[PDB]
Amino acid sequence: QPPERELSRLRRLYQGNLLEESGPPPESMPEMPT
Amino acid sequence: KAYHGGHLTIRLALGGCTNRPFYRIVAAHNKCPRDGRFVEQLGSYDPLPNSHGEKLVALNLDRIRHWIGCGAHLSKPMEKLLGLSGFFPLHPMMITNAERLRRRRAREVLLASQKAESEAKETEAS
Amino acid sequence: RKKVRPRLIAELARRVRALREQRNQPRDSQLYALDYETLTRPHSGRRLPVRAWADVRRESRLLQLLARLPLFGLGRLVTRKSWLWQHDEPCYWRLTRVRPDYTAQNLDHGRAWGILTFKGKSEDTAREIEQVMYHDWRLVPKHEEEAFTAFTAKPEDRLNSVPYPPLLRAMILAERQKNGDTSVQEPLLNLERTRMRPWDYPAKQETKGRAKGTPV
Amino acid sequence: LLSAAYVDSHQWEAREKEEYHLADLASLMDKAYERKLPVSSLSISRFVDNIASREDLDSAEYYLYKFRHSPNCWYLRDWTIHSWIRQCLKYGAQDKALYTLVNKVQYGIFPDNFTFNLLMDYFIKKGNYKDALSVVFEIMMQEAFDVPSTQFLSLYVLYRCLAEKTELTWEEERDFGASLLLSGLKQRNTVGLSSQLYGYALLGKVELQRGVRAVYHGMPLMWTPGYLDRALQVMERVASSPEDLKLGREVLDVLDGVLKVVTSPDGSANLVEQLDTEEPEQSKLPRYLERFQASRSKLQELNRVESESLLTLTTQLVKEKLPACEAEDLATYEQKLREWHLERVQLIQREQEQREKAKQEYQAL
Ligand SMILES: [Mg+2]
């Protein structure tokens, strides 16, 4: 997980062209839905 | 042709026929055509699973080490092959792409559960 | 052979074209002029990228700052807004020589030299400054120099050695056993010799190319 | 404020100067610019030295402009810059001197502190405090409050003008704030510490009304937000200082007014320049207002407030200390004249040698 200060440094650098912030990915590969 | 400028590179040269791709791992001056003049052949890559279900990569690890020691660059597909083999560390985008795929399947599973829950509401309505 | 014959016109053309380049060299005021309404360079018609639009209207060029100072600000400290936003540690140039473009009607284009201090670490020699025509420079006030330049280095925590890749580690251990060397030491890569500078580290301006003098 | 001895021009008028006809010298420079050839610093120096009339100043003004936009702009000599201001004052062309000083980027006139006092003091004696204020703002823009004499004169002009100006525009608050702060920092007396708190207050007003970029853009000031925090620290420092220091009551009222006003108000250059994690200055005003009242109570309890107005305190400071500064400045002025005289002789000698060599070169050719 990036430091909270560094995530804000990027929100200032790319202000106006941002995406929803992503958290830690799933621990394993989710079983394919069937 | 008589090239001026450029560097040696290790890349994949596309061979085979239509719908049947096959690659030759080669060391070549970067300005040469993809399938044209090369310096040395360093292996081959067959991207199609064989009868045993195995995609076959051949790496001349002695000559590859020689040409990386002499300044040879690497193409991005070749860095991915060297990472899967274990000769290089896994490429940053190999890890990032696998994380994106995990996050994208997590959503799909959640949507299916929600649809089943919505279908459960339909079952409750009867 | 001997049927290959001289090409006087080709030799004359090469030399003649060279003379025009030397005499008709363009100037910084002309190559790096800008139209702020369209954000496009008139000399070549080059339109600046989108991510630079805000700063072109909101920030100053280096020699715009230095033209207002006595001796063109020799000895003063100058930083960049891009560095201020990216790095917490002080990053600045200590100016030593400044050659403005006298042709410019405001003396706002030229070349500069100085000593770099990037992320708190100072270089030992002066070199030419790159990206002098960028709208990114901020002159440091004299009364704020002491607080601005104050830096205490933290102990370096980046690893100095790492394991070998899984296959390349197995090949090393296999060679040891084949050669009779019996040991359980783990092969380790040493990263000190090959540590990478930041991507935004100032580059060598002396060896950089200059745009041609043919207008579009 | 300065004595007649400080503004006397007997020493400058007694300098050894070569006699060159301006017309002849004008032609030499004109030919050089036509051929795109560099002009000597000694040449422009000779022109300024031999100005003999009001009309000659107009011609010299054009050539100083041409010199600035030439290959040898950097080599304009200090004595040449000082002679220009001395000649302008001599022939009554004070407006011309102030014009070139404000348009320094075009003419290249960056005077030393002694020359600044000569021009600033002329306006003060004539009562033109609008021109004198312009000189002070130019000194601030160049960050040239080094000599103590300049600091005393600058603070007298600022406080005298502020008393007359009941209404201040945001540009005036910024210019006055910067001038007070920079001049005040040099001075450790009560007047100096009052001007530091006065300057931070005005700049804090512009920070919370128009943004921090209005304060620092094109100004010799820092870009970190929190100018009202710097003002409050001055109060906290004086209150807790072991030595007995006092802050004028007038400044404290200014800060109280600023805090109230900000607390209860009634193309693509739109960027958020502060990190999201950091608290905005607007949100911090409630805490700022508590510190002010606490500091004001402690200061009054310790009797560290000076009821006297800042204009009256500054006048006493100038009277007491300025006489001593005049003696020191005039002593340095004499040394500068001798240093300039020697350097000028060296340039004249070097010019003569190269011209003699030029004859030998033609003889060989
Ligand atoms: Mg770049």
- Find out whether D141 and D220 touch, Cβ atoms under 8 Å: yes
Q: Do D142 and C102 touch (CB under 8 A)?
A: no
The angle subtended at Cα C110 by Cα C108 and Cα C116, nearest 5°, is 110
Inspect the interface and report whether the beta carbons of A29 and B102 lie closer than 8 Å: yes
Chosen from A20, A29, A31 to mutate, greatest number of chain B CBs within 10 A:
A29
Contact residues on chain C for A8, CB-CB shorter than 8 A = none
Residue C117 three-state SS: strand
CB contact set of B41 (below 8 Å; sequence gap of 6+)? B24, B25, B26, B27, B60
Q: Left, alpha or beta for B18 (phi > 0: left; psi -120 to 50: alpha)?
A: beta
Tokens 């995990």 correspond to B102
* A9 contacts on C by Cβ (under 8 Å): 85-86
User: Which of chain B's residues have a Cβ under 8 Å away from the Cβ of C196?
Assistant: none
Distance (Å, whole) CA D328 – CA D127: 26
Judge whether C21 and C94 are in contact, CB under 8 Å.
no
Which residues are bridge partners to C176 per DSSP?
none
Please tell me the distance in Å from D273's CA to the nearest CA on chain A: 7
Q: What single-letter amino acid sits at C83?
A: W
Inform me whether the C-beta atom of residue C199 falls under 8 Å from chain A C-beta atoms.
no
Distance (Å, whole) CA C111 – CA D253: 48
Angstrom distance (rounded) from CA D257 to CA D22: 58
Which residue, among A23, A12, D323, has the nearest Cα to B107 in the 3D structure?
A23
Q: What are the backbone dihedrals phi and psi of residue B55, each rounded to the nearest 5 degrees, phi first?
A: -85, 125
A11 touches D at CB < 8 Å: yes
Q: Which residues of chain A have a CB within 8 Å of the CB of B105?
A: 26, 29-30, 32-33
Q: Answer yes or no: do C86 and A13 touch at CB < 8 A.
A: yes
Residue D273 with chain A: CB contacts under 8 Å: 12
Distances, alpha carbon B35 to alpha carbons C145, C148, D304, in Å: 59, 57, 87
Distance CA B68, CA B62 (A): 10
In the reported structure, the alpha carbon of residue C153 is separated from the centroid of ligand 1 by a whole-number distance in angstroms of: 27
E strand or H helix at B27, and its extent? strand B20-29
8 Å CB contact of B106 and A22: no
Q: Do A4 and D271 touch (CB under 8 A)?
A: no
Tokens of D62: 């054009």
The reported resolution of this PDB entry, expressed in Å, is: 3.2
Q: Distance between CA atoms of B44 and B16, rounded to whole angstroms?
A: 12
Q: How far is the CA of C198 from the centre of ligand 1 (A)?
A: 11
CA distance B102 to chain A (A): 5
Nearest CA in chain C to A7: C86
Measured CA to CA, the distance from residue C116 to residue C77 in angstroms comes to: 10
Task: Report the alpha-carbon distance of residue D165 to residue D160 in Å, rounded.
Answer: 9
Closest CA to D15 of D345, D349, D353: D345
d(CA C76, CA C95): 6
- What 3-state class would DSSP assign to C112? strand
Q: Where are the beta strands (DSSP E) in chain C?
A: 77-80, 92-100, 110-118, 121-122, 127-128, 137-139, 161-163, 188-190
Residue D52 DSSP symbol: -
Contact C167 B85 (CB under 8 A): yes
Is there a contact between A11 and D276 if contact means CB atoms under 8 Å apart?
Answer: yes
Angstrom distance (rounded) from CA D180 to CA D204: 13
Instruction: Give the closest-approach CA distance of D207 to chain A in angstroms.
Output: 20
> Who among B99, B109, B112 is closest to A25 (CB)?
B99
A-interface mutation test, from B100, B105, B114, most A Cβ less than 10 A away: B105
How close does chain A come to C51, measured CA to CA in Å? 9
Helix runs in chain D, H state only: 10-13, 22-34, 41-49, 54-68, 78-90, 94-102, 104-107, 113-126, 129-141, 148-164, 170-186, 190-210, 212-216, 227-240, 249-263, 281-301, 310-364
Select from D1, D10, D45, D109 the least CA-distant residue to D333.
D10
Ligand 1 midpoint to CA B18 (Å): 41
Residue numbers in D near C67 (CB within 8 A): 105
CA of B83 to the centre of ligand 1 (A): 28
Q: Which residues of C touch B (CB under 8 A)?
A: 165-168, 170-171
Geometric angle at alpha carbon C145, from C142 and C148, rounded to 5°: 145
- Ligand 1 center from residue A3 Cα (angstroms): 26
CB D60 within 8 A of CB D100: no
Which pair of tokens denotes residue D207? 């920070």
Kindly list the residues from chain D whose CB atom is less than 8 angstroms away from the CB atom of residue C69: 110, 142
As given in the structure block, the two tokens for residue D157 are 């002009």
Token readout for D312 is 């009256």
